[PDB]
């Protein structure tokens, strides 16, 4: 309810792998929901210079 996943609409907790769409919509998306591998996720967390965007925002 507070942080609805942009795909499954379920709650995005602190102990779950999730990524914010800094590209536009500013919504949180579960890593698993977006179909992102743990390897991609870890690198994205490591790269402060990288900005991620959801399929919806990127298709705009």
């Amino acid at each position: 309810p507070v942080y609805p996943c942009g795909i499954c609409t379920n709650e995005v907790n602190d102990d779950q792998d999730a990524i914010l769409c800094e590209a536009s919509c500013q919504k949180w998306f579960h890593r698993i929901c977006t179909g992102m591998t743990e390897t991609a996720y870890g690198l994205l967390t490591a790269e402060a210079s990288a900005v991620w965007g959801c399929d919806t925002c990127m298709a705009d």
Binding site: V12, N13, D14, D15, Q16, D17, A18, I19, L20, E22, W28, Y41, G42, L44, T45, E47, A50, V51, W52
Partner: peptide, 6 residues
Amino acid sequence: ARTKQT
């Protein structure tokens, strides 16, 4: 990229 891993 901003992630929950923090």
